RNA sequence: AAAAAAAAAAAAAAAAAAAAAAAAAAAAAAAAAAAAAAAAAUUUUUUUUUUUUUUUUUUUUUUUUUUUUUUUUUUUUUUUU
């Protein structure tokens, strides 16, 4: 299934959210790339658990809701690349990154705080994923202290 | 039955000014590409024309030695016409 450039910004609270994706246990990859996505509703990728990969890149996505991918545990390739992500919790990216092969979510304001990529510098420094440019185009934007560094680059021993 | 003033809801149509977006086209600025082309700085091949060194074949010329003939001017001596 692909929907790229189709503006499903909307689509996903007045007049009811769209329950999409209902019962697509077949479903191998789901692409929403450049939809123009704004939020994620709750309860719209359960029961796939056969899907594959999935590509929500070139959106604006901040408000990442706990546990949106439960039933996501064969997830093979996430791509969140250039959106407006700021905080990688573990709540929400858990299951995906439980046998993830690749990785893409460059081209973000990533925020290089304790309270935000803490996990994700964790994981990152204790996995073997593919994370292509993960040391060139990871770059953080606040606080200014850590404004362009290295996502990697980033001691958590300080905060736990 | 009908017409009107203040107070309250409003549904539809015709227009507009804004905000959040999204495809499409057209402009530029950077990373690459495939090429038909262009030089320049390092190797060397083939061919033509010519220079120098060296080894030898043919022809010609000079000199020295040896040798065979056509001519010889001499004959010391020998028998004589």
């Known amino acids: 299934l692909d929907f790229q450039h189709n503006n499903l910004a909307r689509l996903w609270n007045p007049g009811g959210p769209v329950n ?15 939809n123009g996505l704004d939020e994620i509703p ?3 990728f359960k029961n796939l658990f ?3 990969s999935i590509n929500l890149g070139l959106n604006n996505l901040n408000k990442l809701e706990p546990f949106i991918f439960d039933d996501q545990t064969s997830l093979r390739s996430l791509n969140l690349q250039k959106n407006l992500i700021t905080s990688v919790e573990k709540d929400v990216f858990g299951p995906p990154f439980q046998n993830l092969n690749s990785l893409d979510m460059r081209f973000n ?5 304790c309270e935000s990529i803490s996990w994700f510098v ?6 073997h994923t593919n994370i292509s440019e993960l040391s060139t185009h990871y770059l953080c934007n606040t606080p200014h202290h850590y404004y362009g560094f290295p996502l990697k680059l980033f001691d958590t021993s300080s905060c736990k």
């Open 50 to 52: 056969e899907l594959k």
């Open 20 to 34: 999409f994706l209902k019962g697509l246990s077949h479903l191998h990859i789901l692409n929403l790339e450049s």
């Open 109 to 113: 304001p990533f925020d290089c705080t």
């Open 42 to 44: 709750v309860g719209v």
């Open 122 to 127: 964790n994981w990152i420094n204790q996995t």
